[PDB]
Structure formats: C-alpha cells, structure tokens
Paper text:
The spliceosome excises introns from nascent messenger RNA (1) in the form of a lariat containing an unusual 2′,5′-phosphodiester linkage (2). Hydrolysis of this linkage is rate-limiting in lariat degradation after splicing, and is required for efficient maturation of many small nucleolar RNAs (snoRNA) and micro RNAs (mirtrons) that are derived from intronic RNA. Dbr1 is tuned to hydrolyze 2′,5′-phosphodiester RNA linkages in branched RNA and not the considerably more abundant canonical 3′,5′-phosphodiester linkages, although the molecular basis for this selectivity has remained elusive for several decades despite extensive biochemical characterization of the enzyme. Sequence analyses predict Dbr1 consists of an N-terminal domain belonging to the metallophosphoesterase (MPE) superfamily of enzymes and a C-terminal domain (CTD) lacking detectible sequence similarity to any other class of protein.
The α pocket cysteine of Dbr1 was substituted to serine to prevent hydrolysis of larger RNA substrate analogs, such as AK65, a synthetic, linear RNA that possesses the 2′ phosphate at the conserved branchpoint adenosine but lacks the 2′ nucleotide that would be present in the complete lariat branchpoint. The structure of the AK65•Dbr1(C14S) complex shows that the enzyme engages the branchpoint nucleotide in a C2′-endo conformation that, in concert with stacking of the adenine base between His16 and Tyr64, places the pseudo-equatorial 2′ phosphate adjacent to the metal binding center and within hydrogen bonding distance of Asn90 and His91. There are few sequence-specific protein-RNA interactions at the branchpoint, consistent with the need for Dbr1 to hydrolyze lariat RNAs containing atypical branchpoint nucleotides. However, a pyrimidine is predicted to be suboptimal for aromatic stacking with His16 and Tyr64, consistent with the reduced activity observed toward cytidine branchpoints. Conversely, substitution by guanosine could promote tighter binding of the branchpoint nucleotide through hydrogen bonding interactions between N1 and N2 and the side chain of Gln47. The structure also demonstrates that the LRL element unique to Dbr1 enzymes acts as a recognition module, with five of its residues (Ile132, Lys134, Phe136, Phe155 and His156) engaging the single-stranded arm 3′ to the branchpoint adenosine. The interactions between RNA and the LRL are stabilized by secondary contacts between the LRL and the CTD involving residues 141–144 and 290–293, respectively. In the other three AK65•Dbr1 complexes in the asymmetric unit, the 5′ nucleotide is disordered and not visible in the electron density maps. Thus, Dbr1 does not appear to recognize nucleotides 5′ to the branchpoint, but instead recognizes the branchpoint and flanking nucleotides directly and utilizes base stacking interactions between the 2′ and 3′ nucleotides to further stabilize the complex.
Residue numbers in the entry: 5 to 353
Write the structure that this text describes.
C-alpha cells in the first residue's frame, strides 16, 4: 500500500498547465495522486489589484491562472499544499501567515508550520534568504511599500521549527531556495555544466536559514524549487530534491511513499503547541514578531500537561482537521489570531 505524492517546483501562476500535467500522470500510469506539494512562486493573485504585491520583472507582471480557481471557474483536482516563494501575491500570504486555504484544495502552510497528512509530517519554510531582512519584523496590514521585503525568510522560523523532531521524525520539508551548502553534496559538476551561473556562489549557494533547519530536523526529504533545474543530493539521512519551473520537464516529480493510514489534512500537534506558546511574541497585530521576546525561552515553557491542554483547547475552538474556509483573508488573519490568543490566555501563565 503506497501513496503517490506529486512534488512541484515553481508554478509562476500556471495552474491549469500544472494540473493538466498532473492528470496526464494518473492516466499515463494509472497511478493515483494522494496529494500535491508545491515549493513556491505560486502567484496567488485574486484580482488585478493584487498585481501591486507581486514583485517580478516587468515582463512577468501577469495575472496568471490563480484567479480562475479563486472565482470557482476552475477547480483544483488534487489537494494542493504549498509554501511561498519570491514571486507571490505577498499581501494574501501575509494575511495567511498562520496558514490557510487560498481557495478550494489549495492550502498555504504560512510563513512556516508543520502539518499532518496520511501519517506524514510535513514542514514548510516560505520565502527566500536575504541577510538584510532576516531580522525585519512583519508589519500589518500589508503595504505596497513592502512588496520587496515581504517574501524574505526571517531568522525566527529557525526557533519556531527547531524542536519539531523531538517526538517523531519529519517526513518531508519544503523550502523555496536551497539549503546553503547542499549543492556540493550531489553531482554539482553535472549541475554546473548545465547551470554555469551557479559555480560562482560555490558552497554559499542557497539559504543559511534552510541549512540550519535541515541539519536540525534531518527530514527524510527536503524539497526545494526556485533554481530552474532538476537536482538530487544527499546530506546524511536527508534526500534533497530540487525542481524546475512549470512549463518545463524538470518541474514535476513524484514520491511513492508507504501509506500506513489514509488521513485527512490535519494541524500538527507540536506545531500547534509552539504556535500557542509563542503568542506573546505575536500579540501586536501591527508588528510581529516582537523579538524582545526569546522564541526559545517561550518554547522552553512547553510541558506535557500543558501541551495536552493546548491540543484539547485547539480541538474545541478550531478543530484538528484543516478545513476549507471561504472567509476573506483579512477575516481569517483576525480569526486565527483571536483563537490563538484565547487558548494562550486560558492556560493561565
Ligand atoms: Mn523563485
């Protein structure tokens, strides 16, 4: 009993083409896709006004396909999970920094999070690395002046994710840009001949944030897009897989994993606990996180009984199953934060 998981690189707003490719797999092979994982550059523009938040070179200022799905004209055939890249409707993703459905069957994992599906634990890290923004807080509501900085990966996600492999392993981890250094742990020679532009960065190619996270959690798989190429490498127990951009053949691959239990998309318990316990750092809706707080210290307060109560409270107000919610994203921002704050305050601490 195996589950077939589609892994996708950069979409660049080409959804109909991606799904058309995907259905041509379930027929060319007769295999069934359990679900789809996308590693970024989703460009989830709802309508024209969102073009403001899409940082792209001029020739790529396009609406793409997403809005058809947002309108209901098109329907995603597979449950599709994704993180943010460097080309996004960044206002939408900020509204959903704590994750959310952008439309039917399309779930954004947020700035970072861990989810559960079919007995798997999947960790996501959105964005790309620029050193000058790694300590920048998020400002809310989103402003057009932040189009250039919103998609940069913050350092704080390291602390948010670091304890996640304490109780069980991490099956799959996603990022947009590559973990730094991992280019050297594969056939980088074969790569360079095909991508001469990568040679210059050397071992420094990729994100140091993702490097730390990979080393700390050592997932079974690490999947990245962004680099417009196919690539494999091995860092200890972790299989690295890089994917190209939709419209080209290196863009989609498939993971045939053992399916132990079929199980709906669910919030990860440990992630939920971290999410609740770090609330004080995120209590200012205008500017977060507040790094006068230590994410680590806040998370050191996790105890078994506390975790147990959190999961009970989460299950009550929100539910363990991640379900589709068609409320406008600004409502979902406020709503999820309302319940996070409620749960924390009920712990009495
Ligand atoms: Mn990219």
């Amino acid at each position: 009993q195996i589950q077939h998981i589609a892994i996708v690189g950069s979409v660049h707003g080409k959804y109909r083409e991606m799904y058309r490719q995907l259905s041509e797999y379930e027929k060319s092979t007769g295999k069934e896709i359990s679900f789809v994982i996308c590693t970024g550059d989703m460009q989830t523009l709802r309508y024209e006004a969102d073009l403001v938040y899409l940082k792209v070179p001029p020739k790529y200022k396009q609406m793409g396909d997403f809005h058809l799905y947002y309108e209901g004209k098109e329907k995603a055939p597979y449950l599709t999970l994704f993180i943010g890249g460097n080309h996004e409707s960044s206002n939408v993703l900020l509204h959903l920094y704590n994750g959310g459905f952008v439309c039917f069957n399309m779930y954004y994992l947020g700035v970072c999070s861990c989810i559960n599906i079919n007995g798997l634990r999947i960790v996501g890290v959105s964005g790309i690395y620029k050193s000058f923004d790694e300590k920048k807080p998020y400002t809310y509501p989103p402003s057009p002046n932040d189009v250039v900085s919103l998609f940069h990966t913050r350092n704080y996600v390291i602390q948010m994710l670091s304890n996640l492999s304490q109780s069980s392993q991490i099956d799959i981890s996603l990022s947009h840009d590559w973990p730094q250094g991992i280019v050297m742990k594969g056939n980088y020679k074969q790569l360079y001949r095909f991508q001469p532009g990568f040679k210059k960065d050397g071992a420094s190619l990729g994100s140091p944030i993702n490097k730390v996270i990979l080393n700390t959690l050592k997932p079974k798989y690490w999947i990245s897009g962004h680099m417009h190429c196919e690539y494999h490498a091995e860092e200890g127990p972790t299989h690295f897989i890089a994917l190209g951009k939709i419209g080209y053949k290196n863009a989609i691959s498939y993971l045939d994993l053992p399916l132990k239990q079929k199980t709906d998309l669910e919030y990860d318990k440990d992630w939920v606990c971290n999410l609740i316990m770090t609330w004080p750092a995120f209590s200012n809706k205008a500017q977060f996180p507040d790094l006068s707080y230590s994410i680590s210290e806040l998370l050191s307060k996790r105890t078994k009984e506390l975790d147990k109560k959190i999961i009970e409270l989460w299950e009550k107000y929100i539910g363990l199953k991640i379900i589709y919610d068609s409320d406008t994203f600004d409502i979902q921002f406020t709503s999820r934060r309302f319940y996070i704050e409620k749960i924390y305050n009920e712990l009495n601490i």
